[PDB]
């Protein structure tokens, strides 16, 4: 008689957290931001369109210089663009055609990708031979790679479909830390601005906050009904937003340890594929399966605009580090830069 | 200004070289058939091929079959990657914790999925020899509607087997065609085959069904179907 008592004890701790979270709930974010000036309609235009991918685009990432971006397409290609001039700097081929994520190093010297091969491949862009060649292949995940984000030129965190996140050492190719605790496939991750914590969104309709150094889960954020597809960090690092398959986005605060706001509309029934904030943290942009992206007033939960130029499912979406542009990829194999 | 003259000249030349390669391997991409080999369990899946990739060629047409290896049984997420394949090869062990209903429920999810509504399915019903042995020695209890089913008129006699096997194996084929026809039509199609673990001539059947899929797509674009 140990299984029965463990479940009862867990619920005693479970509702205690609910009471603690309910006790801290004084006023909603809507009430505090009820008398603030609304953003108003946001008009964004497709300044540039990047074409050259043979098949659907599954991921894209911006460079820290806010000019170069890498994009992954499931035709087996990883193209690096010069957004200003719409010129392909690189177009590297991948061993596996099923690539589900890509990352760009903060230094800009390395690029990463992964997918159904359960492998993260690091590519050296500044090779002395003049050509881009794969420098490392990180193996050890027992499920497909969903997301990867560089911390340095030597470390990277990867989420996988085996319900596990991992911290890697690229020089040795060994998994330094393993982050376990999720029940379903981990679909996304987001590093904090200080890169000492990160959040992961899984298919168990929950998110978790991890400590990179220690390697244990700090907090767990529930509130979504279905699988969480996208997650992003608020610019100051004290909050984050998540998008899910139940056609809603939610904002969670780490200190309050509770959901703050919900970004849903009755006319929206499709899931959210991508989520990103703006330079100030006032606009929350979310890509949808209904082929268009929605801009959300993050403080008032009022849809302030729509980005509609894609003919298929909007898979990826990111905002530059200076906030000057927004790039959206989609299953129609086209990227678009919006200003 | 001089520095930007050569940098733009060099950058425009690098893009030009890349687009020359991108058109060269676009031709290979379009002329290659990509297939997903999917099985609800063991089902003798590794008999059609005979971990993640296998290339073969029929009549100078390249096929690209992708078996699923170390992935978990939670297919709801990584199966969206295969919405643009030519066809999904679905392999069923017809001689079946009631693994036959599990294959029926899995086929129902694939057929009705939001992103897999344009993707055709090639259905291979394996274990034909094992199905013949079981019915002769004794699926009657698993499917209570079995003792109400008459062998269809347009059924191959298949000389060398008693009609009991033919009635049983055509009942299972009609279970998948019930799902295949009670849902979206014209956009995607089901091709059931009575494969067996004796001959590897199923490669010809995949070629014929892939040609049929492409022809139906072309006619569909011209509004001829």
């Amino acid at each position: 008689s140990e299984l029965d008592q463990l479940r009862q004890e867990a619920e005693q701790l479970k509702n205690q957290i609910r009471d603690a979270r309910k006790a801290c709930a004084d006023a909603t974010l809507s009430q505090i931001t009820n008398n603030i000036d609304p953003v108003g309609r946001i008009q964004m235009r497709t300044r540039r369109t990047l074409r050259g991918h043979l098949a659907k685009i599954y991921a894209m990432h911006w460079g820290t210089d806010s000019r170069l971006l890498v994009s992954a397409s499931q035709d087996g290609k990883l193209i690096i663009w010069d957004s200003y001039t719409t010129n392909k700097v690189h177009a590297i081929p991948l061993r596996s055609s099923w690539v589900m994520t890509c990352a760009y190093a903060p230094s800009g010297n390395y690029v990463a990708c992964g997918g159904l091969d359960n492998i993260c491949s690091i590519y050296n862009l500044k090779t002395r031979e003049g050509n881009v060649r794969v420098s490392r292949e990180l193996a050890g995940h027992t499920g497909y790679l969903s997301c990867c984000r560089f911390l340095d030129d030597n470390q990277i965190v990867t989420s996988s479909g085996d319900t596990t996140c991992a911290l890697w050492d690229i020089e040795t190719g060994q998994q330094t830390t393993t982050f376990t605790g999720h029940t379903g496939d981990v679909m996304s991750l987001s590093l904090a601005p200080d890169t000492r914590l990160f959040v992961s969104g899984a298919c168990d309709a929950s998110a978790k906050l991890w400590d990179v150094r220690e390697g244990m889960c700090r907090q767990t954020f529930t509130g979504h009904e279905s699988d969480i597809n996208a997650i992003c960090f608020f610019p100051n690092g004290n909050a984050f937003a998540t998008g899910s398959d139940d056609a809603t986005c939610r904002l969670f605060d780490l200190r309050a340890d509770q959901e703050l706001m919900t970004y849903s509309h009755d006319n929206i029934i499709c899931g959210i594929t991508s989520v990103s904030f703006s330079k100030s943290g006032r606009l929350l942009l979310a890509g949808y399966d209904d082929f268009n992206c929605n801009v959300w007033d993050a403080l008032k939960a009022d849809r302030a605009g729509v980005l509609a130029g894609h003919d298929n499912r909007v898979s990826c979406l990111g905002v530059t580090d200076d906030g000057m542009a927004v790039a959206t990829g989609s299953w129609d194999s086209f990227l678009k830069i919006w200003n | 200004t001089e520095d930007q003259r050569n940098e733009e000249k060099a950058q425009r030349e690098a893009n030009k070289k890349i687009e020359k390669q991108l058109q060269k391997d676009k031709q290979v991409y379009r002329a290659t058939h990509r297939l997903l080999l999917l099985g609800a369990g063991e089902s003798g899946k590794n008999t059609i091929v005979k971990i993640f990739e296998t290339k073969f060629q029929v009549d100078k047409v390249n096929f690209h079959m992708f078996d699923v290896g170390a992935q978990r049984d939670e297919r709801r997420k990584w199966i969206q990657c295969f919405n643009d394949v030519t066809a999904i090869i679905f392999v069923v062990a017809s001689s079946s914790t009631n693994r036959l209903q599990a294959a029926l429920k899995l086929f129902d999810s694939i057929w009705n999925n939001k992103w897999l509504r344009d993707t055709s399915v090639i259905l291979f019903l394996n274990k034909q020899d094992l199905l013949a042995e079981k019915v002769l020695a004794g699926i009657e209890d698993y499917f209570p509607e079995f003792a109400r089913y008459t062998t269809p008129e347009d059924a191959t006699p298949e000389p060398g087997e008693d009609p009991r096997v033919t009635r049983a194996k055509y009942f299972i084929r009609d279970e998948f065609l019930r799902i295949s026809t009670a849902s979206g039509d014209g956009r995607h199609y089901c091709y059931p085959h009575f494969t067996c673990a004796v001959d590897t001539e199923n490669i010809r059947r995949v070629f014929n069904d892939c040609r049929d899929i492409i022809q139906r797509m072309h006619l569909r674009q011209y509004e001829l179907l």
Partner: nanobody, 128 residues
Framework: QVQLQESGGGLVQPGGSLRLSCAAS????????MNWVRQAPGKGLEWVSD????????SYTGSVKGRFTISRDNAKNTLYLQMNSLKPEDTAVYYC?????????????????????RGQGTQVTVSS
């Protein structure tokens, strides 16, 4: 927090009748298709029945068709499985499973790899 708690079960004589209730919370009940799955001892998860969002579409596994009937009430957020003529082959743990996404006809939910939106399970045992 998606929570599904099953109520009912127990030991009944062969040919008896039993009713199972699945209390749902943490999500909008009306937007999802609900299922019933069971796991007999020594075997894996088996799909028993499912009911659509409205309740118009209903399916059963052939082993229980004609005996079990499934119903949903979109006011109490509950799911029911009325079981009649329980033969000793129905001795299993019955789970209440929910399809992963709303407004969909697909459902990938029989997995033993810790499927998320599934209940704890009520053990239904039949013996003479």
């Amino acid at each position: 927090q998606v929570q599904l708690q099953e109520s009912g079960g127990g030991l009944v004589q062969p040919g008896g009748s039993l009713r199972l209730s699945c209390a749902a919370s943490g999500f909008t009940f009306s937007n999802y298709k609900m299922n019933w799955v069971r796991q007999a001892p020594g075997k894996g998860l088996e799909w028993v029945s499912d009911i659509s969002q409205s309740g118009a579409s209903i399916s059963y596994t052939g082993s229980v068709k004609g005996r079990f009937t499934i119903s949903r009430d979109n006011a109490k957020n509950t799911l029911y499985l009325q079981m009649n003529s329980l033969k000793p082959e129905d001795t299993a743990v019955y789970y209440c499973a929910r399809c992963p996404a709303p407004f969909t006809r697909d459902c990938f939910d029989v997995t033993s790899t810790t499927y998320a939106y599934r209940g704890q399970g009520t053990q239904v045992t039949v013996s003479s």
